Amino acid sequence: KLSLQDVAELIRARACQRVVVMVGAGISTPSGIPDFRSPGSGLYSNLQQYDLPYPEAIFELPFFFHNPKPFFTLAKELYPGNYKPNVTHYFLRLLHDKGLLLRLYTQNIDGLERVSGIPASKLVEAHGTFASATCTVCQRPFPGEDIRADVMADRVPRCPVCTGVVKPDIVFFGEPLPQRFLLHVVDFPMADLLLILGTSLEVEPFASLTEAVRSSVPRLLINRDLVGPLAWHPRSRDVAQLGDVVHGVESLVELLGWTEEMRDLVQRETGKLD
Amino acid sequence: LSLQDVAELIRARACQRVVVMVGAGISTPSGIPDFRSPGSGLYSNLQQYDLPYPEAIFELPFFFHNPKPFFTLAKELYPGNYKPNVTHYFLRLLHDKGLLLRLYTQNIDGLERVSGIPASKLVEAHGTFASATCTVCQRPFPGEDIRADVMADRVPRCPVCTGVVKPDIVFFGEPLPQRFLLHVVDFPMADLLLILGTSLEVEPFASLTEAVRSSVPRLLINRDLVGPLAWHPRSRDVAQLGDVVHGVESLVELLGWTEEMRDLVQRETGKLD
């Protein structure tokens, strides 16, 4: 019905001038991040010490109040600087630079989307971010940098006037989704093309947003398999770039003819990074 | 501490009371498309009815709105269509030898009974097509009774009430069968826990993996490490990771049962076809 070749030509012809992107853990794993600790991993072994009832207990608030040490152990990993953004995050940085990006809805807390240079306005961190925090008592806002010292020292931030725990802005199990998520009402009808990068779509309202786009809008699924509402309810102009995520993005960049421009971006950003 | 050691324990009847927990892992070798995957299978067929989502087939309000999608699925999995695989008969052999204590299954295919395992030895935790209950009549009916209507793309109706006759399947939100509460008795008394091809995503099912006492070893032949086995392991845990059929086959050989196994699958395939 439609191919990645056809999509590249449309972008190249500026037919899709307002792009909404939906990314998940698929794009972070090429960067080495174990966003889920399920496999055997260094981050996995440490959290078993605390004897949590189950792996998702750290995201649940009541267990945290019992013992906040496991969550901050996780935070110590994901705090910016430890891991680097990969080609995917820079492909979306290129999408922004060209003036095409409308919004980037991400399921990740790694923060690599902002690290790669994408402004917060063009970005909806749908599960939160470690870039800010609020005292669990005074409900006072603090930037990420403020608590960086304490986190990296295996300590638990206490704030200045409260001396109460300073939790970063992470959406815990039961917490309402970020205010910025409600931009889906504005963004999705106006989008002219939907990109989905490495998202299982088994969790809603994320999955539900795939049907928000107009019937003219094509939907590009570069995930390793066809998943979510795309499989149950596909559209005619949909394109499934199934396979390894980096392979799909690289092919699409080649088909767009941006590899030359792409190499420059990865270089100058790697320099600033280290 | 290793797969052979478990086999030797069973082989010597040191593990005389085995509790087994199986999932859709052991059915897919039989050809059953239980998973309702995006590729060729029922998926496209149930899309005709324009479900809101694939799991909507097992909702009570939608089924009352439109019961045709569920019965479409039923026609497929209804007994006499698919055959049991090596796993299902390996557990039948375990029963015949007097070793099986109970078989807790997450599957609705029914191949466990087809393979010869009695209903008493079985806890079909998501339901079974061995019975039905009229949604209005509230009268129980045997499985075979509705086969004609189901297999003819029709919707069965109760004889006196003429109301829909829904198989005994546990729809999303309905309480698990009373038969599930045997877990209180079985698991403390169990002598060995066998886990074959279950994701352990469902937490009421998953929680039972830790129910056995710490003396009991737990054998996980599932492809990957999941559930409380992976998250919170014990010393006596054994993980025979890899393809399910091969893992069961290796255990059968390690038990010295390969000859008796080939005998069972052959003569049982004869009875069926």
Binding site: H127, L177, F181, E204 | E55, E174, L176, E201
Partner: peptide, 13 residues
């Protein structure tokens, strides 16, 4: 109470 699709969800609102 079997396999309730919403096993664990971060509520949107």
């Amino acid at each position: 109470s079997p396999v309730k699709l919403k096993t664990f969800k971060x509520i949107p609102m």
